[PDB]
Assembly symmetry: C2
Homo-oligomer: 124 residues x 2
């Protein structure tokens, strides 16, 4: 079974690019990160910063999570992100995503020792 921290890395980290460079970014990344296996994951955000910078958010601003838990943290700075969301044309096994690049604060839930991101809550 994948650990929570490793699942967060696979689902939400893309440090290899500064930003989504085209409309096809999401189609490619959702497939390669194995997020379209038996169904299309409807919504997923990738963060274009170093793993260290994203891990560091766990000791930044403590804020509530949408679900009411209190282990969420909001990055002090904006970060480059890409939101991927299914379009109307999306139909498994032919998943189709809209790519929206932005620079926003991220909010992650953190857990464990080491205390690291385990969920992506939202961006602001």
């Amino acid at each position: 079974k994948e650990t929570a921290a490793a699942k967060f890395e696979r689902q939400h980290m893309d440090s290899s690019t500064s930003a989504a460079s085209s409309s096809n970014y999401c189609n490619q990344m959702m497939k390669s990160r194995n997020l379209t296996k038996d169904r299309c994951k409807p919504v997923n955000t990738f963060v274009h910063e170093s793993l260290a910078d994203v891990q560091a958010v766990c000791s930044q601003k403590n804020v509530a999570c949408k679900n009411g838990q209190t282990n969420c943290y909001q990055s002090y700075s904006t970060m480059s992100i890409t939101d991927c969301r299914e379009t109307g044309s999306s139909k498994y096994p032919n998943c189709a995503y809209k790519t929206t690049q932005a620079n926003k604060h991220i909010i992650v839930a953190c857990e464990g020792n080491p205390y690291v991101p385990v969920h992506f809550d939202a961006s602001v």
Copy 2:
């Protein structure tokens, strides 16, 4: 019982200002919109655009909702928003919120006739 559309208006519309003008905006708005009754609502976004502009999003870009439903729409333009989230010092009945102002696309779920916003899904 409050209708879904009216609840969205109360929870998510603040057309009276162009933007959050201070750190105390959220404390004030979460209280006045009755979002701190028996408990502090942990997270809540207000949109600083006209009601018409926000309603119009329901005929803009159709995208998946985080929960996998297909009745979500992403605004073509960015909009002025304020995210309100509880801080560590927040303890009912003394709710306390961090105010984060941003300009982002909004994503809403739409329903009904007229087809209007009934949930705030996320911003990008």
